[PDB]
């Protein structure tokens, strides 16, 4: 299994006197950290959120990011000085394979504008031209370039390998789906709904069936989160009146040990 580690920063600037920055961290679909604007300290959302890092190591990384957050805020407010409101997002982390690839992407007003790539910050084609000078100035600082390079090439994939070991039983958990059927009218026709809730991990197969024949009208919804780190999904089927009889919803999931759930309408 490939895991994508993502550190997400969300920074809002309303005016010269008002801003907030909040961050979350995800390993795959499990949240590992939160960092509220109001908190001086990063909050663990798992028992294993420190990975393999020592207390002193974590204390200093936290301190480093504390200065980053203040520094970032000051620099953006000064960039605006030299139109509110402004929204900035950063998505940084690494995709694991024992290889990996790191990324650091930045969005301005909800649009991707800048990445760090190789040894330098780069604007993406079509980004506003006013970014070129600020980015040139940022690239002149070799110290921060090195810092970002060490963070992406070494600190990220090393941290993540440790998270994978310390969080194994959570990452590899199996939670069984529970399913139920309902319906609503859909024309002068009915829409049957197969609900599947409480499953983990995310991969699942849900299909309306007539015996062994898959009903290709099956319309799978999006994966929706439950609040207990499980997933919800529904699959619908539009059926003509009288053709309801003999239909079933079949669910396959890794937790079920080869025994599919089959509910009959």
């Amino acid at each position: 299994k490939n895991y994508t580690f993502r550190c997400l920063q969300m920074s809002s600037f309303a005016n010269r006197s008002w801003s907030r920055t909040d961050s979350v961290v995800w390993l795959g679909d499990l949240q590992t950290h939160r960092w509220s604007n109001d908190s001086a300290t990063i909050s663990f959302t798992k028992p294993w959120s420190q990975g393999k890092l020592s207390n002193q190591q974590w204390e200093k990384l936290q301190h480093m990011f504390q200065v980053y957050r203040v520094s970032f805020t000051r620099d953006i407010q000064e960039l605006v000085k030299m139109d509110y409101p402004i929204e900035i997002q950063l998505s940084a982390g690494c995709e694991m394979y024992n290889a990996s690839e790191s990324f650091l992407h930045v969005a301005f007003q909800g649009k991707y504008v800048v990445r760090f790539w190789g040894t330098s910050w780069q604007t993406v084609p079509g980004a506003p031209s006013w970014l070129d000078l600020p980015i040139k100035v940022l690239n002149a600082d070799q110290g921060t370039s090195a810092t970002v390079q060490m963070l992406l090439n070494d600190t990220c994939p090393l941290f993540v390998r440790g998270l994978l070991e310390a969080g194994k039983s959570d990452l590899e958990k199996q939670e069984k789906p529970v399913a139920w059927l309902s319906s609503v009218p859909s024309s002068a026709h009915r829409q049957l709904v197969c609900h599947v809730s409480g499953f983990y991990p995310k991969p699942v197969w849900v299909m309306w069936m007539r015996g062994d024949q898959e009903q290709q009208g099956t319309h799978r919804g999006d994966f929706l989160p439950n609040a207990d780190e499980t997933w919800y999904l529904q699959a619908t089927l539009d059926v003509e009146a009288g053709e309801e009889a003999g239909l079933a919803c079949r669910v396959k999931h890794s937790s079920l040990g080869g025994q599919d759930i089959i509910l009959y309408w």
Partner: peptide
């Protein structure tokens, strides 16, 4: 441009180095 982040990066480079 980016005065504080540049100061930050230069400050924490040695920490990450070792």
């Amino acid at each position: 441009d980016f005065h504080h982040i540049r100061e930050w990066g230069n400050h924490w480079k040695n920490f990450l180095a070792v």
